[PDB]
């Protein structure tokens, strides 16, 4: 309704569940990893002035990061105070390691050391005040292997805020803005059913049209639904994209 | 004159560049002076006299008996032998003991330079046993340099009688 | 005596098992008994309570020397018996001790000269002390106990056992013999050792993982299976103690059948593990020998078993074997035993790369380092005492890789 005064949802997302299921065709270590759902968006005009190395906190109701995924928290000095707060909040099983910024800069200097730290956790969360430093220190070994630290605001440093922020951080999808006209957003996996997947799509679309696309949903060229190896089924096409680009330019 | 290979090896010392980089790491781990040790202890004394739990210290290991015991225990990561010990037989076995124990070792110049690191007039041998996590890469790069600039170099030269 | 009962009730032992029916009463009279029981029947209490009574009856003292000699085929079995005898002699004054292969022989000699009344020995080490150690008083020997006689014969201590009987006095000395199976060698040894006219009593999974990655694969596997029931078999109690201590130190709470070498705690821990729907328990093969295996989703053979014939019958939810590449010869023995098997494959990426952090934790802690050395040394000594010398050859084992699994940068200095 917001995008084009129409809602061609539900039917396409539900059909995609059967489309990937039909395309199904001893090991010791097993995991519940599922193929992600890639929501492709095309915009009429470029949406990024420059490479922004922070994710978008797209709040969602169906988390794309399972609660079994380990988390690593990066805080400002000293690390002992925030280590005590994490333990007192009951996040020991979630926030496994808390690394102070000075310790992260010093004790992890080699590329192999940075890669070992990167592979030791599934998601990285960072204090909002220390996020601008992580472009350095962490380097290309983090920002290209799908490991972008999350800007979690823990400024006041209290247990309830930590629990709310982590739950909010886990229950959200992220997308790193890049200068282009096309991008993909993680909407979920096959584990999430059709109705939950549809809810994730519309919530992301509202967030995208609000704080990502400068002119809103009117500037959306086309949108498609895709998986790792599935066909990019066209979710929706702008009925007036061709004339809008001609008139704008 | 003609010198045996075990004494001839001390004329082939570490190069100036690698030695200068070695002492940059060593100077981070100097033992605290007699004055600095007294200041730290008296500071804890006042905290006891009036009314009131640390980490393990970090420093470079020195002393001939101490270092040889650390090599035999395989506790030493890098052993730096003075090139001009007045009785040479004091350190004439150290390159062989370091080879047997797999300890990266180098023969550096000016035993006085070694003593300056430890606030002493003179040191026959210095040994780095275990450093802070910040300097793991710096020590690792030095050990690789000592392998190439001292062990890969010479080596075939250290088995030949020098002089003559 | 009341001291025996006060010690027994400390272990939480009530009533009295079936094999002890034909052994404990007649043996209390000082008559030779030819016992024969299966694994786990409780023979440890069978030949210890009457003998301990006889120490108290004769008022033996360390100046008298050794009065009872107990022979066990392996280090772990002898150590387990020594742990039980320590519990039974809690309220006593008769000295007890153990001599085993691969142990400090000089330290054992200093302990033997002081006077050990109840000696638990191995056939290899006992012959060395009986011939060479000076000041070892054993002329007052009064009781002799042999446990798992068939195991001793199959190991290759027939020659050693013959010299023991020729050296040890035979007059007015009570003798015992316990064997699961009665073979020609067992009968021949009984005829030359026991007194005339005795009272006779009557699917597999494996992972080919290198030594250095043995623990890292295990730790990652336990993290994955935190929502199941896991029971792990080890080659020693010291190895059990260290891994249980280390796992609790890296936020992986586990249970072990070691406790503080207290028999009551082991039964309590096993009872709690059986009652609990989910959990993880570590124990050695000898501790689990003859016990009742509950409904466990995963059974793990972290270390190779010392009795392959008993293990292949004990297995008959899922079975796992941590087999080193140098131990791949055990696969051929499985075919000769006609047992179906499958190979488990794991990706190197999923294995936890915590080895560098593991070494730092062990080096920084005194008790972790002390436990790690004891576990490493005992694991090697148990390895050298394996029956399958051809398959589990200690020389072929890479000691540098093994010590990496225990959290050591370099292999510690352990003898044999």
Swiss-Prot record, chain A:
The keyword Transmembrane appears for this protein: no
Key words of the record: Nucleus, Ribosome biogenesis, rRNA processing
GO CC terms in record: nucleolus; preribosome
Chief location category: nucleus
UniProt-annotated location(s): Nucleus, Nucleolus
GO biological processes: assembly of large subunit precursor of preribosome; maturation of SSU-rRNA
GO MF annotations, alphabetized: RNA binding
Superkingdom as given in the UniProt entry: Eukaryota
Membership in a protein family: Belongs to the universal ribosomal protein uL1 family. Highly divergent.
Subunit-level organization: Component of the 90S pre-ribosomes.
Record function comment: Involved in rRNA-processing and ribosome biosynthesis.
Protein's UniProt name: Putative ribosome biogenesis protein C8F11.04
Portion of the full-length sequence here: 5 to 265 of 373
UniProtKB/Swiss-Prot annotation, chain B:
GO-annotated molecular function: RNA binding; structural constituent of ribosome
An annotated GO BP: maturation of LSU-rRNA
Keywords: Cytoplasm, Phosphoprotein, Ribonucleoprotein, Ribosomal protein
Domain of life of the organism encoding this protein: Eukaryota
Cellular location(s): Cytoplasm
Any single GO CC term annotated in Swiss-Prot or TrEMBL for this entry: preribosome
Function per UniProt: Component of the ribosome, a large ribonucleoprotein complex responsible for the synthesis of proteins in the cell. The small ribosomal subunit (SSU) binds messenger RNAs (mRNAs) and translates the encoded message by selecting cognate aminoacyl-transfer RNA (tRNA) molecules. The large subunit (LSU) contains the ribosomal catalytic site termed the peptidyl transferase center (PTC), which catalyzes the formation of peptide bonds, thereby polymerizing the amino acids delivered by tRNAs into a polypeptide chain.
Recorded family membership: Belongs to the eukaryotic ribosomal protein eL8 family.
Subunit organization: Component of the large ribosomal subunit (LSU). Mature yeast ribosomes consist of a small (40S) and a large (60S) subunit. The 40S small subunit contains 1 molecule of ribosomal RNA (18S rRNA) and at least 33 different proteins. The large 60S subunit contains 3 rRNA molecules (25S, 5.8S and 5S rRNA) and at least 46 different proteins.
UniProt protein name: Large ribosomal subunit protein eL8
Protein source organism: Schizosaccharomyces pombe (strain 972 / ATCC 24843) (Fission yeast)
